From Swiss-Prot, chains A, B:
Subcellular location: Cytoplasm
Gene3D superfamilies hit by this protein: Globins
Family: Belongs to the globin family.
Transport is among the record's keywords: yes
Subunit structure: Homodimer.
Any one annotated GO CC term: cytoplasm
Main location: cytoplasm
Keywords of the record: Cytoplasm, Heme, Iron, Metal-binding, Oxygen transport, Transport
Protease found in the keyword field: no
Listed name of the protein: Globin-1
Domain (Globin): residue spans on this chain: 8-145
Residues that coordinate or bind heme b: 100
């Protein structure tokens, strides 16, 4: 259940999420596109879900991909900002879950984002400790799908 | 067409947008809900588009409405952050427009948000000057619908 998953966000997990986001969230356009390009490269099977974006291999040059990527980073920003209040984190998570549920994105499918996050984190000197913290946040979303 | 609308965003308009956002965007939950509840109060017909939110009369206490309202404010945060780069502003606005186009929301219907914005701004003491600046930002979105 999403309510139980949200309870997994302990003090130190929230702290690691904030400290890493301070760096990653500094460049939403660059890191956003990096996150999406890595997902498509590591999991080509997911490209089909993004037909609306057009040629995803163009990266930054693709306006729709860039617009999508920047927006994705504001969803993460939203989550980080709601860490203080579990009640608000949950309602924002379920809200965001609806859009993915509508596109028939399962919890297992959503979980594929963990790889790309771990890689982007690593490129900024944030190791496993941080990747695992982010995995916990992603898990909250998975519980709502 | 969206680029042309974005041209109306002059240096003075962008300055008023940023200054007012510094206050309005500081309480996303509070002001986001105030915006939505004012829209419903002044234009009851718009409630027809929000059946998914349920009992919108509960206001802040309604989790779905609260979740939706906080998220709406991050859309504005996104727009405000992209003001200095027309290319990025445009791709984000177009991305956002897709969701409202799919829900058959016309430019005229979308423009009904201008009244609520003016009232929320006035509640924080930002006069007509600021309301006019925000109406121009809204116009960029309308150009995409
Ligand atoms: C960190 C995790 C993720 C975040 C925060 C995220 C965020 C978002 C946001 C904010 C949108 C745009 C608003 C909307 O249309 O609902 C979106 C759209 C979408 N997401 Fe995700 N997402 C994530 C992971 C995934 C994954 C792993 C998949 C599936 C492989 C997925 C599939 C989709 C699809 C298909 C769209 C529609 C794109 C379009 O046609 O414009 N998302 N996502
Ligand atoms: C400043 C103006 C506005 C902003 C920033 C805004 C923002 C948003 C965002 C971010 C979403 C959720 C993500 C998505 O699914 O696309 C959304 C959904 C929606 N918006 Fe807007 N919106 C605005 C004005 C309006 C107006 C005036 C209407 C029309 C009466 C409208 C109708 C809708 C509808 C029907 C949904 C889906 C709600 C749901 O089922 O949860 N929006 N809007």
């Amino acid at each position: 259940s999403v309510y139980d998953a949200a309870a997994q966000l302990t003090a130190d997990v929230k702290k690691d999420l904030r400290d890493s986001w301070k760096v990653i969230g500094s460049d939403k356009k660059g890191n956003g596109v990096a996150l999406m390009t890595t997902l498509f490269a590591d999991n080509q099977e997911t490209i089909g879900y993004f037909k609306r974006l057009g040629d995803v291999s163009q990266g930054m040059a693709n306006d729709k991909l860039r617009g999508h990527s920047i927006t994705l980073m504001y969803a993460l920003q939203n989550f980080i900002d709601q860490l203080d209040n579990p009640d608000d984190l949950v309602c924002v998570v379920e809200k965001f879950a609806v859009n993915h549920i509508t596109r028939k994105i399962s919890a297992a499918e959503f979980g594929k984002i963990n790889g790309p996050i771990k890689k982007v984190l690593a490129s900024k000197n944030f190791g496993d400790k941080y990747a695992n913290a982010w995995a916990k946040l992603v898990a909250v979303v998975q519980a709502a799908l």
